[model samples]
Target: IDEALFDAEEKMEKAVAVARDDLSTIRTGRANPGMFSRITIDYYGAATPITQLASINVPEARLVVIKPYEANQLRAIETAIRNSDLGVNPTNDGALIRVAVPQLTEERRRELVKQAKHKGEEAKVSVRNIRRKAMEELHRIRKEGEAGEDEVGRAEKDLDKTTHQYVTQIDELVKHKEGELLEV
Candidate 1:
């Protein structure tokens, strides 16, 4: 039962990490290299991370320049950016791709905030799923007489606490991201 709780905590931590990464992908009013971290493009028949194919630089607060290592892949990268939810258009000048991240409009910021909250909710659901599985494991132990009712009860309480801790972390992350999005 204790082992189950440990495993659940570890998994919850991973879920929170993923949520943090996801939140960073939502664009803000400025140029953030992480804004493009979630984008992927077809690189030789395989979906590849854009970071792996180019050097992303922020020369200004609202502009990002991507210099692809392979010149032939520049068009593919531009097309991928065009298709992404980032809402930014990429201009290619033969040498590199320039993505001008405009100041987010009021409506766009609201939409991005919604996306951040949605990501937070998904992370919370994943944490809850881990808790449920751990609860089931505890119940199975109790039923098989490996642990008494009192022991399982304590384990279940601990599992709930662990889940809450991680869930709160995710909430804080989302709140921070929301602030980032809404900030002028």
Candidate 2:
């Protein structure tokens, strides 16, 4: 029973980590290189994450610079940035690309806050799924005579507690992200 709880918790941890990554990718008032984490560019013959092909730099508060390892791929990388949802246009020189991160308007910031909340809600749903599976495992153990009624009951309670804790943790992350988005 404890083992099942441990496994379920491990999955919940992974789910939260995913949520953190997803929310961080949402653009706030500040420029972040992590904003490009979800972008993929065609390199040579393969679709690869842009970070793998270039060095991302933040030289100023509202600027991002990307220099591809191979100079010829600059156009493809710029095209990928243009196609992204970031809404920033990349100006390319012969060897590198520069992005001027614009200040988001009030309406856009609100929309980003909504996106962060949505990601948090998705993480909560994943945590619930993990909890359901864990509960089902407890039931299976009980039905198979692997544990006592008292033990199963205790495990169920622990599962509920663990699930609640993780959901609350995700909520906290969302609130933090929301605050950051609205900080302008």
Candidate 3:
């Protein structure tokens, strides 16, 4: 039915949103707030993101300045940064922590492009699953005599077009990230 189309589109929308969040964790040549969005630190029996524990600032293109609200949480924050895949170390100077984000090597940049491609492919697969389910529902409606062949045929065509439309979006997202990774 037409209802299935909206539902499938909504699901695809979420898939795109999820892909954006997944891409945020990938490293770039410059220090980005999103780069630290996924790192969580152990805080008083609860895991807390670094964003919650401190004020994150990019004083320069390559440096991150973290000033924690509670000074004592410095070590825990430092530990979390070290544990993350950021490939940088946090230097604690008793008051604030400074992380010097190094520029990526050519090989490392190429590898990151691969990682972005993998994440992009995952969203593309999810879109296909959504399309398949919508197509099945349309077929079911026609089989049950709920709609005439003409109506169902048009619906199927629309569904296929929609599928391609969203699939192109995922490809665009991947291409955008790959360009960023390759940029100097």
Candidate 4:
């Protein structure tokens, strides 16, 4: 009974962390390594994250240079970037693949903002689901008389406060991403 709140808070923390990762994949006008966090490349017949396969560098605001750890994997890296939905081309210089993050057009920025909000909504749902499950467990404990009414009421309040904090964190992340996408 006492562990219920701890479990719920742990799940809520994970949900917010997932939200942050999801929002980082959305591109803005400036180049960001997180933009490629979701891109996967075919490696030895298995799909692997590009980050693991290469070293990424940002020498300029709009450019990303990916240097594969294994020189032979150059073509595979290029192919992965080419197949990504980032809408940019990767140029191979035999040793490194340079990706120029293009300027975000007005229409494109709006589309990205919508995608960010959608991710935010999904994260909120995940958080709420955790809270709902915790509430159900609390009720079960009360019905079984495992915990007294006063202790259960206090635990409920504690769970609500923790949930509110996580929800607010997700909201702030979405708001920041919107700002980043719309900024020229």
lDDT values, one for every candidate: 0.89, 0.90, 0.87, 0.89
Candidate 4 off by > 4 Å: none
Ranking by TM-score: 4, 2, 1, 3
Tell me how candidate 3 scores on lDDT. Answer: 0.87
Per-residue lDDT for 24-116 in model 1, tens only?
888887667678877899898999989889999988888899999999999888999989988888898988999988788899999999999
Clashing residue pairs in candidate 1, if any? Answer: none
TM-score of model 3 (CA atoms): 0.88
Residue range 24-87, candidate 3, lDDT tens digits: 7788876778788778988888888888888889988889898889999988888889878888
Q: After superposition, how far is residue 103 of candidate 4 from its true place, in Å?
A: 0.6
lDDT of 1 at 93: 91
Give the runs in model 3 whose Cα sits over 4 Å from its true position: 93-95
Q: Which ten residues in a row have the lowest lDDT in candidate 4?
A: 28-37
- List ranges where model 2 is wrong by over 4 Å: none
lDDT for model 2, please.
Answer: 0.90
TM-score of 1: 0.89
lDDT of 4 at 169: 93
**lDDT (0-100) at residue 122 of candidate 3?**
94
Per-candidate TM-score against the hidden true structure: 0.89, 0.91, 0.88, 0.94
| Candidate topping TM-score | 4
Angstrom error at residue 35, model 3: 1.9
